[PDB]
Amino acid sequence: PFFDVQKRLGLDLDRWMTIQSAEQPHKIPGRCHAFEKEWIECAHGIGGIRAEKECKIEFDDFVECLLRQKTMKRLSAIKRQRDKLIKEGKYTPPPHHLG
Amino acid sequence: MNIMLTLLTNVTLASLLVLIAFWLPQLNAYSEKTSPYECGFDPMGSARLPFSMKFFLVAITFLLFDLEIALLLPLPWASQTNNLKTMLTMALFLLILLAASLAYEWTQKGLEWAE
Amino acid sequence: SMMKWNRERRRLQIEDFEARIALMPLFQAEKDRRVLQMLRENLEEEAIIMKDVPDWKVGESVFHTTRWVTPMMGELYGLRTNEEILSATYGFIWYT
Amino acid sequence: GEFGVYLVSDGSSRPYRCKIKAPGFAHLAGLDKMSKGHMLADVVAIIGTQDIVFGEVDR
Amino acid sequence: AGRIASFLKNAWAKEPVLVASFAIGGLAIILPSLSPYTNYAIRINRATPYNYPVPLRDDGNMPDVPSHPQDPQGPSLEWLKNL
Amino acid sequence: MWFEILPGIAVMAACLFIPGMATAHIHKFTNGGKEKRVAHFSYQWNLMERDRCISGVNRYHVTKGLENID
Amino acid sequence: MFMINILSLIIPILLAVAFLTLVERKVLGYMQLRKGPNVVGPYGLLQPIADALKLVTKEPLRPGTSSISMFIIAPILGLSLALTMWVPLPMPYPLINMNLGVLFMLAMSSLAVYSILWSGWASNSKYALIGALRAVAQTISYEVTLAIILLSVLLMNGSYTLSTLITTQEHIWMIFTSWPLAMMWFISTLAETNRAPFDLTEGESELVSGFNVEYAAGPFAMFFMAEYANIIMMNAFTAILFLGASHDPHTPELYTINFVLKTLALTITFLWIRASYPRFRYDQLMHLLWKSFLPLTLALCMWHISLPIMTASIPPQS
Amino acid sequence: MTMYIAFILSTIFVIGFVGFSSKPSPIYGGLGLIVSGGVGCGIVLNFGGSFLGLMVFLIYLGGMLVVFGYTTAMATEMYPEVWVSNKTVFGAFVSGLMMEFCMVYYALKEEEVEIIFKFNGLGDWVIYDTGDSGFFSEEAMGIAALYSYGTWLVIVTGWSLLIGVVVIMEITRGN
Amino acid sequence: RGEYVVAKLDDLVNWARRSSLWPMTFGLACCAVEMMHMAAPRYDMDRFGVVFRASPRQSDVMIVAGTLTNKMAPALRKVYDQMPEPRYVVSMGSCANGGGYYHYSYSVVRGCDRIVPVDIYVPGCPPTAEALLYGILQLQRKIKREKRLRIWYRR
Amino acid sequence: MELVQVLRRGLQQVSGHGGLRGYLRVLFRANDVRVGTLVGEDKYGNKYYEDNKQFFGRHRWVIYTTEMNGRDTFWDVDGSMVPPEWHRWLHCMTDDP
Amino acid sequence: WKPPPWNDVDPPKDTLVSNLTLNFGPQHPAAHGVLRLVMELSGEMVRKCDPHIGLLHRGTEKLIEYKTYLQALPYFDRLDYVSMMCNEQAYSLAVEKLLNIQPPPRAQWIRVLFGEITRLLNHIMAVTTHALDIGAMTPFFWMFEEREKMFEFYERVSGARMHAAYIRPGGVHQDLPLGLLDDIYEFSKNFSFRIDELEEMLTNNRIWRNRTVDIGVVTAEDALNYGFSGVMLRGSGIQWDLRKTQPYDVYDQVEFDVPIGSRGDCYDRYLCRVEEMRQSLRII
Amino acid sequence: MPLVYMNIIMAFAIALAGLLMYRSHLMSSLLCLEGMMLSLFIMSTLIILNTHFTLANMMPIILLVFAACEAALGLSLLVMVSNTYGTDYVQNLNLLQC
Ligand SMILES: COC1=C(OC)C(=O)C(C/C=C(/C)CC/C=C(/C)CC/C=C(\C)CC/C=C(\C)CC/C=C(/C)CC/C=C(\C)CC/C=C(/C)CC/C=C(\C)CC/C=C(\C)CCC=C(C)C)=C(C)C1=O
Ligand code: SF4
């Protein structure tokens, strides 16, 4: 905040929602509670400048958890491979993938 | 699956109804038959000129009213909380405020028609 | 009359939920095996897919962290029958 | 209302002039004076209470 | 006193609707506090389990929590069964 | 004689009766005699899939009792 | 067979909508020292079919000044909503069981006004615009409480699912617990359908026919079903909402017979009210509701939220 | 096919979004918005946000309803516009429908894309997660927390509507 | 034979029309008030299938009942032109059958037919609420006896 | 027992009109199933019924002939098929058939 | 360019008023067929109403010039076609006055008697169609069955339902048929049990009250100056009635009350007409 | 990023193009003003359902409640644009050019 009163008078107005790893109704965890738990206690009171370099290899692991960016890239590459030999007809899926 | 199947079936049946309605009955159009109806005589000529209705003020307030009916809709699930003391206070706030907004809307003319 | 009946319905809901939680450990005990089995079949088959690839290490964790994550459903039902994935994702949401 | 006739007779077997005071004739002239600020639905109501039939007014 | 009672009577005559709304609306705010079941209502909501009562590891010195979901020790809700 | 009103609502009474009759019987017929399952929550939907998988015939409304297990 | 169910929920309703017209003519007539239609077949039972063929073979008038595309969408939009808003109704077992049934009830009920809206605009006339805008004025006052009464009554049901309404009403009728709300809901359901004291939008004596002035043959015939299928469905909504009958788990016949009879009794009262009272004025209608109805809704909704907590009688969510 | 049904529902959201953003006659734009709003309900309904879909549906019908009343009240012309009549809106119309056509083709054809962000077209079904909700709906239970966790949000929101009626009367007072 | 199916479809169409014709709300003078008595519970026109719908866009038979004058004759023909097809006009009462009492005046058109193609003529001054009750039913017989498709199948 | 009285009264209606076939004829063609007394039958075949205990106006009525002067007068009938001599009695112009 | 107004108020724009012009007729069901009301209204409230009449101008007063006095009688019969006997009563009295001839005592009594059931007819028409135009259709039909009965008395004495042409100068055409008066007594017994039935339907109904109370209110002097008569005077408080002030025929020898209103609005006249019903029953 | 997030984001893009690129109707502009709320509402609802952000599930309606407030006061600006200028087209309001 610019003029921090939430800390001063000691009453929470918006901190409860600011993150997805905070306490949720009936303990419904977020999708990436494990990552946001680790990321938050990684760069806490260490410094915003002293955060983007050291709490990095843990941060993108979280940013991947939200968006599955390179994970979906993996599926696209695999599915792209399927199209390029199924038409060529070298391989057939095992019955596990049919029934 | 079922929901859009139900939706598709209904629009289809309606389309056929208007289709046989608008095609079958052996039309005969002669211009004055298609002329606008004006209670027996000719129209003065407009019907797209701005029809200045007098409930404009009550119109927008209805929009504000609906914006807060959406707010007070989660009450059936809100009652199943562990903090009814807080939930009851905040719930009664909305209705008190909604009445208060109407009360100002009422007392300072407002609801009354414009003449 | 409503106030008595509603409390009775509450009594049933705990009774309903108690049967749910008692049965829950078995349901969790089945789910992990199915997802592990599903992940395996994709990865065992992934060796055949990624044999002729110039550079694709089989079974690489997309995340740097070695802790297991909740597996992403997209790769769970990735190459399964198109009907199966369709029911898997939009099943409940379409069920009626 | 006060239906009245003004009969002028020349003395022959037929009338010479017959003016017909229609109670609705004077009434209907007052439609504008009544319906001042009232809405159209009121005008429908004002017509009904006036009890006008147009045979008498159009003569 | 007389003015206040007359104003109520003048209201009740001129308008019966808002006074009825104001009255029953006014009550809806007050008796929730005076009700002796409101503390029971939160207990009922707390009793209903939506998530699993996840077990916890034993290390001794824990008499309160039971070792079996039939043992006498633990939170019991026979109050709600009769209620 | 007000009886003549009744024939009008009489066929109407049957007319509204058909839908509720149809849905109940169609649900009873398709879902193996048993009343159609309700899935208002993921737990019910998760439960329904388990029944379908263990049914073998890929049909939720095929319940196998203790004779299935040993 | 789900498709067979869909027609079994559409065609039987459609004949029910058809015979409401004959029933209303006879009910209105017999409340008038008249006899009602009794020559078209026996007891006038063939009258709806007689009007059915005439309208669909009637010359469907296309007005030149009308915008044609919007002209045809309105009858389609009116009828399509009327049928599809029957599908979540819990006739013993609802055809479409959804956790948010009443919200879907309001959504297409709110979507319904765009029929009279677009048709009123597309007709391109004075009486067309007068009817359409007073239709706004009639319906603008209308959703604000319709949601509140729905919220207040359902707040002790447990959720927005229509199926669980029967479980709540298993012991006593909902009207015993919220009769002040039921009268107010009933007036609004009498009002949302533009019926009896609130029929300004049509206004035969004052708007000739309102929005329906330039609507003939099937385009008219479609407008009649949307109005009348909404009458039956709204009364059926009220019947489940307030007079939920007993439901045997093994014989859905019992609920179906009881539920249908409740809808018939309520729909007759719609004709009962239609015969008796005069017609309001659209300013008084708005003044009646936002000056007298709406204030009572807020306090009554205030009462119906405080009541479950104070009595420890909150309903189960699941 | 219904497998990319969300791909479809997303599109007609924007064709309707384009149609009314081409600035046709005000009520015609009202139709152009509601079709997008109606299909827009479908996309979020597909993802699980049943309550969110119904509320964006419900109040925007109410929102668009009051818009129509004002359009014909003091915002309509004696010669109304159509999407075809005026060439300016016609040019705006045709530009919108080829803008999506050329792009969704490009996104679907390459499935990698670069514009603004990187997009794997693949399938929106993919990112759904293997999760169980138990006997409670997250989309509805989280909103129910507004009255137990968001007291500040309730106060600020509720207050704002109150001036919302104040301003709606303050500026309309007409001296 | 195609004649049989044409005749069967012939009977189906007209029976719908003759049992559902809607007289407009078009009253003029003395001849209109007693026509209300036809709609009154005594004779109950509605029992015979008719309904008194306004809005000539949704009406079949036009009950020209009363003195047809000069100042309104444009209004009537505009109204008649607005009525969809089929449309019938029953000239009701002696005033609309040629001028009635005021046949020789200066602002009355002598006969409703000079403006509109006038169907079956019911006389009376006024015709009794029953006298044209037959007039309406006699038109129902005229609707019964039409050929339409029979001509079309033989055109 | 008034319920079963009106029930059996309706049963005497169906039996009175020559059985079920006659009942269906008068219902489909005459639109009314009340029985009366044959006060006379004209040369053209129109039966004349009459019932003093009746609301004034329904106390006298005619069942029209099935044949009159060649034209088929099954379901299509009119009011002019009343011969004059019976027109007086039918229209309450006299109480003498 | 131009500097902004130094008081910071721009010159008021020229009027852009676009009030609707609507012709309520001559086909509207409430227009009663021949009423061409061109009214200037903004939105849904009227500002000025120009009542174009003439859609029913039969040259009655012109044609009477060419007919003998006896032949001119049916003109008045057709004039106000809901108060037939009262219409001929006006014309007959004028001709008798000019002829200096009085009708026989029996004639004057049935002229008053039939002139009063004529008041029953018109007031039935006025109140019922009022409710019909307002939107209450049911009260329309219930009386119209009863006023159908009164048309029977019309025809039993004259020959035609509406246009009796019965009240002639010098007395009525011919005596009443035997048993006519008894039939009058039977109906008059039943009628008061229906007039209150109408009052039960509307008089205390809140919807009818709001649609009719304090609406279309006309004061005393303006109503008197406007040439008003009948209910327009008695409704606003002016205690005037020709049957009492200047009694024609034998109206003096009949006791009756004249209902006078106080508010003068639409509602007060509705009671004035309904009360005129019952007062007419005393005259009968 | 999937195509659903894509096509929604692109939707707000031409909503801007509709918004600021103007025309001869202020109503149609404010139509696009509440229109671009659709994209942001639908966009926002997609993430927090996807991320199982239970708390942030109230942020859409809170966003959407404030949404029509702009429209609410926007319509009231229109009416006295009409009250004083009769019409709505955005060229007659230029007296403040000076
Ligand atoms: C000025 O002058 C005047 C007159 O005189 C000239 C008069 O006399 C009178 C007196 C007459 C009166 C009757 C008094 C009332 C009249 C007025 C004008 C006063 C004003 C009226 C009102 C305020 C009330 C108006 C009420 C109305 C119109 C009633 C409406 C309701 C009804 C039930 C009646 C109409 C019913 C209809 C049309 C029948 C049903 C409709 C259909 C379309 C038929 C069914 C069709 C289908 C099912 C579709 C086909 C599908 C099928 C068959 C399904 C299978 C096939 C598939 C493919 C699916 C007055 C007042 C007057 O002022
Ligand atoms: S025909 Fe006779 S009753 Fe009919 S309007 Fe003319 S004068 Fe009057």
Numbering used by the authors:
A (entry chain 1e): 1 to 99
B (entry chain 1A): 1 to 115
C (entry chain 1Z): 49 to 144
D (entry chain 1D): 372 to 430
E (entry chain 1b): 1 to 83
F (entry chain 1a): 1 to 70
G (entry chain 1H): 1 to 318
H (entry chain 1J): 1 to 175
Lines quoted from the article behind this entry:
A key group of these are the respiratory chain supercomplexes (SCs); these which primarily consist of complexes I, III2 and IV (CI, CIII2 and CIV) in varying stoichiometries, which serve as the minimal functional units for NADH:O2 oxidoreduction. Our structures, with an average resolution of approximately 2.5 Å and local resolution up to 1.8 Å in the best regions, enable in-depth study of mitochondrial respiratory SCs in their native states. Our in situ structures also capture numerous reactive intermediates within these respiratory supercomplexes, shedding light on the dynamic processes of the ubiquinone/ubiquinol exchange mechanism in complex I and the Q-cycle in complex III.
The three other states show not only conformational differences in the Q10 headgroup and the key residue H59NDUFS2 but also long-range structural changes away from the Q10 headgroup and along the whole Q10. State γ is distinguished by housing a Q10 molecule with a headgroup aligned more parallel with the membrane and a contorted midsection of the Q tail. Although the M-distance remains consistent with that in state β, the E-distance is reduced by 3 Å, a change attributable to its silkworm-like undulatory motion. In addition, active-apo and all different Q/QH2-binding states were dominantly in the closed conformation (except state β), implying that the closed form may be sufficient for the catalytic cycle.
